Amino acid sequence: AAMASVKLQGLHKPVYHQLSDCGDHVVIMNTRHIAFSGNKWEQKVYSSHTGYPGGFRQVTAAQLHQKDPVAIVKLAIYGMLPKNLHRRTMMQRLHLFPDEDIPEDILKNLVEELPQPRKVPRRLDEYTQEEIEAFPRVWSPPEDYRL
Amino acid sequence: ISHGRVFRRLGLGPESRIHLLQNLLTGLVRHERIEASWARVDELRGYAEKLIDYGKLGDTNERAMRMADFWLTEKDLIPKLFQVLAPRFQGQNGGYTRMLQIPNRNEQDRAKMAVIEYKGNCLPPLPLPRRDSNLTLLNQLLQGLRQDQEASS
């Protein structure tokens, strides 16, 4: 959301000004595979009130993502944009998709892809055998131990 | 909740409702054409239809005489009902009276007026709404369908 908020506002154009209608569309795909850091999947909660008495609902982050796949990202951006009346206008330019199923109309409008802000670590099975042999063996286990 | 209520609240109550229609009905029998408020005339139509039905029963039937005694508050109209109105209506069954909407009264209240009258009265005819003549363009086109339909079927 940090880089998506900048693009929506237009804070990347040197011609920026709040009165002007400068703003860029952002298309975010694979929003079902987001990775919350730490234990925020079970600790962070999203709460809302329906208005009627006894209508206070608190939903855990895991529960909300299991029901609405794009709700986690949309709420994160919806809270980072400026709190004026332009926030409703500039949220309409944000397109969210749970997976890589994008309509052909949207695909033909794209220009460039923003880099990922977090370098994804690779698992043990993704390391090539050349890398495994290159990394030194730190210790020498005894021959008589049973693993 | 007025579901199924076919009668109307008029005057000072159920008793005053009958008396208001009693005076209107008496005027309708004597003059054969009266004008009043549209709501009161609409109610009066129902009684004027059935009063002739009691008149057809005869001068000798006691129920008809007692029924006509109450409704005809002027006592010189009972012979008229059994000897003029009743003999005149022998053919038709329910086509006794006509109701038309007179324009609003030229007064402050601006009530919705109606004119109620008996068939065959000795008065100038009302300006009834006349339908389009068969020579009109729309009617002539439709008559073409009927002539062709009757030619084959």
Binding site: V15, V111, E112, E113 | -
Partner: protein, 150 residues
Amino acid sequence: TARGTASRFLTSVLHNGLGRYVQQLQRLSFSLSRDAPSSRGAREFVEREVTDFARRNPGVVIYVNPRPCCVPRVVAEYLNGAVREESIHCKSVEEIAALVQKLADQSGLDVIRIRKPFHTDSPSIQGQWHPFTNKPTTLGGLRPREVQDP
């Protein structure tokens, strides 16, 4: 306030000062009195400074019309057509000279709020910024997730 009054951009009439400088002041008309004590400043200015002022500025025409009046006035007209009324009622000699000198240096445009302290034509030297002026071009102009034709 700024929202109450009108505004204009910094503009020079007839592109003045580009090829040559032309004094935009055109004429002055002094309406003073010969007996009114309030016209003393105007009378002293006419006797002493008017003759020298005309020599320094040959492009203006000075009219002096001594007539019965209570409030002396000086009317200045400019080339673009703007006429500015002024009152020299009960002022010292040096105040009149300062006031008249200021009217000689004004371009004649309306004295209202100027939106910007600069004016320029064709400021986009070596190009103006557009969202494609700093984005590298991809081989074949392919979209981020576009499949190649072959």
